[PDB]
Amino acid sequence: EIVMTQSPDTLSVSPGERVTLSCRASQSVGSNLVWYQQKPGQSTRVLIYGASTRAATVPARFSGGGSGTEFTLTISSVQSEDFAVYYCYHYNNWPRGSFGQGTKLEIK
Amino acid sequence: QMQLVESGGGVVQPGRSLRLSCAASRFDFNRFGMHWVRQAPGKGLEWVAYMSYDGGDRYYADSVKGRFTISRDNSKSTLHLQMDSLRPEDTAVYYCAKDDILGDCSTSHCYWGYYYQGMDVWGHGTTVTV
Ligand SMILES: *[C@@H]1O[C@H](CO)[C@@H](O[C@@H]2O[C@H](CO)[C@@H](O[C@@H]3O[C@H](CO[C@H]4O[C@H](CO[C@H]5O[C@H](CO)[C@@H](O)[C@H](O)[C@@H]5O[C@H]5O[C@H](CO)[C@@H](O)[C@H](O)[C@@H]5O)[C@@H](O)[C@H](O[C@H]5O[C@H](CO)[C@@H](O)[C@H](O)[C@@H]5O[C@H]5O[C@H](CO)[C@@H](O)[C@H](O)[C@@H]5O)[C@@H]4O)[C@@H](O)[C@H](O[C@H]4O[C@H](CO)[C@@H](O)[C@H](O)[C@@H]4O[C@H]4O[C@H](CO)[C@@H](O)[C@H](O)[C@@H]4O[C@H]4O[C@H](CO)[C@@H](O)[C@H](O)[C@@H]4O)[C@@H]3O)[C@H](O)[C@H]2NC(C)=O)[C@H](O)[C@H]1NC(C)=O
Ligand SMILES: *[C@@H]1O[C@H](CO)[C@@H](O[C@@H]2O[C@H](CO)[C@@H](O[C@@H]3O[C@H](CO[C@H]4O[C@H](CO)[C@@H](O)[C@H](O[C@H]5O[C@H](CO)[C@@H](O)[C@H](O)[C@@H]5O[C@H]5O[C@H](CO)[C@@H](O)[C@H](O)[C@@H]5O)[C@@H]4O)[C@@H](O)[C@H](O[C@H]4O[C@H](CO)[C@@H](O)[C@H](O)[C@@H]4O)[C@@H]3O)[C@H](O)[C@H]2NC(C)=O)[C@H](O)[C@H]1NC(C)=O
Ligand SMILES: *[C@@H]1O[C@H](CO)[C@@H](O)[C@H](O)[C@H]1NC(C)=O
């Protein structure tokens, strides 16, 4: 069974700068990774699939990367809307797949 | 407008059975596979159930293995989930989600290994307490 761990689950960061999150897997998962973002009082949207592909209608500051068992996701110029909770999801055994634990960014 | 709605849930004591409903609005309910996902307070999400577009396959995580049963009906455009033998660890909020890939193609010329997008539209989720 494959399970992934995000760290840190809490990262308080001022708006305006760059920040990169990481999500590594127990065993190598390949390129079957999705990055979900959830804001409270709002439906969740898909940010990146195939472990590097920006979905349509997504701003040009989100960028995923990595393969094997070490995946990363970078935001360049974090603004007011980018405050949410992010998850890394895998589907190596599609249609069945497991989630992460999450990461809630905040302000300093 | 590409939205799902949820019905059911409330307060309930253990050793009982519920049945939640998720109604689709506009897109379609005969060409897509659906998911039931849950999140416990203070934790992250977890995929609990997946159902095919025609019902030819059903999958559940092992946590709710056995005591759960998923089904759908396209003519009424609704996905139902029956949960029996509740446990005090099943207090959580539940959402229904859709697959950003067509069902009939998903293995022939539409293969998920290359052209899968994750989950385009989500619901809002109802709370359940044990
Ligand atoms: C090879 O390979 C390749 C590569 O790999 C590939 O390709 C691919 O393919 C695929 C398939 O096809 C594709 O995909 C597709 O796409 C399309 C498009 O459309 C649209 O889009 C966009 C949007 O997007 C969004 O959404 C969606 C859904 O909807 C998704 O999917 C995505 O991802 C995104 O997501 C998002 O969303 C939200 C937000 O918003 C959230 O929630 C989420 O999460 C996310 O975030 C848009 O934008 C667009 O627009 C554009 O375009 C157009 C044209 O096209 C124009 O007109 C406009 O204007 C715009 O433009 C722009 O851009 C351009 C470019 O493009 C430029 O140039 C300009 O300039 C500008 O800038 C459009 O509109 C779509 O549609 C699809 O989807 C669909 O389908 C699916 C299945 O498949 C499903 O799932 C979905 O849902 C949908 O569904 C729909 O439809 C169907 C059919 O028809 C039906 O059945 C259903 O029911 C539905 O319907 C409904 O709803 C709607 C809504 O509104 C309405 O309308 C109706 O009426 C009803 O109601 C898909 O997605 C892709 O793209 C591609 N890629 C590339 C790169 O290209 C290929 O395929 C291959 N090939 C072979 C052979 O193999
Ligand atoms: C161009 O267009 C052509 C034309 O079609 C495309 O061709 C397609 O190419 C893909 C990839 O090359 C082919 O996929 C391969 O499918 C086989 C056979 O799979 C069937 O039989 C097995 C029995 O051997 C069943 O178990 C399968 O059912 C499982 O998977 C389906 C979806 O994949 C799922 O709905 C079922 O419920 C079931 O899932 C359960 O089992 C899986 C394990 O299989 C488990 O992970 C999951 O969690 C569920 O418990 C299906 O009926 C398959 O063997 C191949 O590889 C698989 O096994 C290897 C073993 O190492 C794995 O590494 C690999 O990841 C797979 O798991 C492929 O999946 C497809 O058949 C083929 N289409 C046709 C019509 O032939 C091209 O792809 C197109 N090219 C481009 C570039 O676009
Ligand atoms: C590509 O798929 C093969 C099949 O097992 C795997 O061994 C390899 O690590 C994969 N490479 C990438 C970059 O996804």
Cβ separation of A43 and B112 shorter than 8 Å? no
Q: How many CB contacts within 8 angstroms connect chain A with chain B?
A: 53
Closest chain A CA to residue B5: A43
Q: Which residues contact B101 (CB under 8 A, 6 or more apart)?
A: B32, B110, B112, B115, B116, B117
Q: Name the token pair of A19.
A: 């920040």
Cβ separation of A46 and B45 shorter than 8 Å? no
Q: Which residues contact A13 (CB under 8 A, 6 or more apart)?
A: A19, A78, A105, A106, A107, A108
CA–CA gap between residue B120 and residue B75 (Å, rounded): 22
The number of distinct structural domains making up chain B is: 1
The structure was resolved experimentally with cryo-EM
Closest chain B CA to residue A47: B118
Of ligand 3's atoms, which has the minimum distance to the CA of residue A67?
A: 13
Q: Give the CATH number of the domain where residue B96 resides.
A: 2.60.40.10
Distance of CA A52 to the CA centre of its chain: 11
CATH superfamily of domain region A4-106: Immunoglobulins (2.60.40.10)
> Cβ–Cβ contacts within 10 Å for residue A26, how many?
11
Domain ranges of chain A: 4-106
User: Residues B79, B21: contact at Cβ < 8 Å?
Assistant: yes
User: Residues B20, B8: contact at Cβ < 8 Å?
Assistant: yes
CA–CA gap between residue B68 and residue A12 (Å, rounded): 39
For residue B113, what is the enclosing H or E element? Answer: helix B112-115
Of ligand 1's atoms, which has the minimum distance to the CA of residue A58?
A: 46
Domain with B95 in it? 4-128
Q: Supply the Cα-derived Rg of chain A in whole angstroms.
A: 13
Q: Which residues contact A103 (CB under 8 A, 6 or more apart)?
A: A6, A7, A8, A9, A10, A11, A21, A85, A86, A87
* Angstrom resolution of this structure: 2.8
CA–CA gap between residue B61 and residue B25 (Å, rounded): 27
DSSP string, A79-98: -GGG-SEEEEEE-TBTTB--
Residues of B in contact with A46 (CB under 8 A): 100, 117-120
